[PDB]
């Protein structure tokens, strides 16, 4: 139930919130909302046990 963002194209300004959910472009081919090579979701879920 807890998620953290690990991929972004820049660094945040102090006291800023960004809650957008778009597929990160880590390569050259566009993601177009579909996961694949060089295309990952920006938010990874925590694994608390």
């Amino acid at each position: 139930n807890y998620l953290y963002r690990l991929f972004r194209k820049s660094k945040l300004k102090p006291f800023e919130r960004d809650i957008s959910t778009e597929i990160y472009q880590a390569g050259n081919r566009p993601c177009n909302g579909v996961a694949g090579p060089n295309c990952y979701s920006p938010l990874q879920s925590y694994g608390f046990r």
């Binding site: 919130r17 960004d18 809650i19 957008s20 778009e22």
Partner: peptide, 30 residues
């Protein structure tokens, strides 16, 4: 009034300030 934002396509928070000569309405959501 004035609108503010990055892309303004219901993908990010967009600051909106509206004057109607009675109050000032400020909202953040897209």
């Amino acid at each position: 009034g004035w609108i503010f934002g990055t892309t303004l396509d219901s993908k990010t928070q967009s600051l909106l300030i509206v004057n109607n000569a009675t109050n000032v309405v400020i909202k953040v959501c897209e």
